[PDB]
Protein: Beta-secretase 1
Organism: Homo sapiens
Amino acid sequence: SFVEMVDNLRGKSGQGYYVEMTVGSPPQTLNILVDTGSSNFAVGAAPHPFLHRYYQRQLSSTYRDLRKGVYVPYTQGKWEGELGTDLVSIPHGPNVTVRANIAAITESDKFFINGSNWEGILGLAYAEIARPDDSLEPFFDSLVKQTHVPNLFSLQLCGASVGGSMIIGGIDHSLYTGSLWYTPIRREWYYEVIIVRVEINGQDLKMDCKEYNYDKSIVDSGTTNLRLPKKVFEAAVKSIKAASSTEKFPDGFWLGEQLVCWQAGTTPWNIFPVISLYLMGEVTNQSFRITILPQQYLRPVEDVATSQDDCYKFAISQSSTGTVMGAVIMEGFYVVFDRARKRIGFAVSACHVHDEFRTAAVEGPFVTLDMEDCGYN
Ligand SMILES: O=S1(=O)C[C@@H](Cc2ccc(O)c(Br)c2)[C@H](O)[C@@H](NCc2cccc(C3CC3)c2)C1
């Protein structure tokens, strides 16, 4: 019965993916951003320039105030509001209704995006990182406890304006090709995993694998880019520059500031290398890899003028909070958040990218010794 959830996600490039939900009685329709990088379910509950609509607690008869404030600071943007509970459902999802915690956003800063089409956020990560504290039961946890929906979900994020699917309670075998490869969830807070090796164009970066996960590595559908720790980022950029030394790009480009352009349909994809991230496997000394094509870390953006040339932005940025595998990584892959078995699965998506002589992939099995030492402590 997962077919009903296929294609239940929409959104704009770089503005996140959202699914339709309803809260309160009678049901109030809202587009909620799907974010595996947080654990708070929050929605606008007051007027805002970027909000076409919002949650009105007054009109909901099933609303319950918790008389307790709350705020959440993201890497970029933040909001604060009032806690409470109410009935929630997902039209294009499982046919159920659960009472979940809801943070009514009353004030925010750089959180809502102008014209994103969503008015809330659904944090699918664990309680450990929920605000104010890990006692605020996350939405998915409530769903699993109050219904018979299996403890897992999968995400198929498709690029291009953008669409995808969020299969709640299972895996839809029609959304991916090949085999699914699983990596352990190291700890249940963020969806933390362990990168044991990195290669660019088949060339190993040869860095202490601890650097790849300093201070952690997470799968964040709520982040657009692939964010890398300072040292790793520098090495990656240096390698990518050399691979594309044929052409010249402004230094601001490698910082995600300036967008490079090329004649409509003349993008030199070949000069850009593929990036391979090896992840910890499910058995001793075993790992697997996911390969990313340039069409993934070169997010396309509208021409800065009236020109009709292909312009893109470097979707790989530096991080100070660990590696972040955002949409640019997830796009083209079918990702299974198998909470019940503490693992995350990856498979080539049915809506993957298309390069002439190259292809995004998930390959295994590989042998990698001392993977344990790759985790940071
Ligand atoms: O770039 S982010 O801030 C986008 C954010 C979700 C978000 C928020 C506002 C937006 O317009 C968009 Br688009 C997306 C994620 O949720 C973050 N996930 C990691 C994280 C980083 C710092 C603090 C937290 C606290 C747990 C929530 C989580 C990464």
User: Anything to note?
Assistant: The pocket of 3P5 is lined by residues 15-16, 35, 37-38, 72, 74-77, 111, 113, 129, 220, 222-223 (CB under 6 Å).
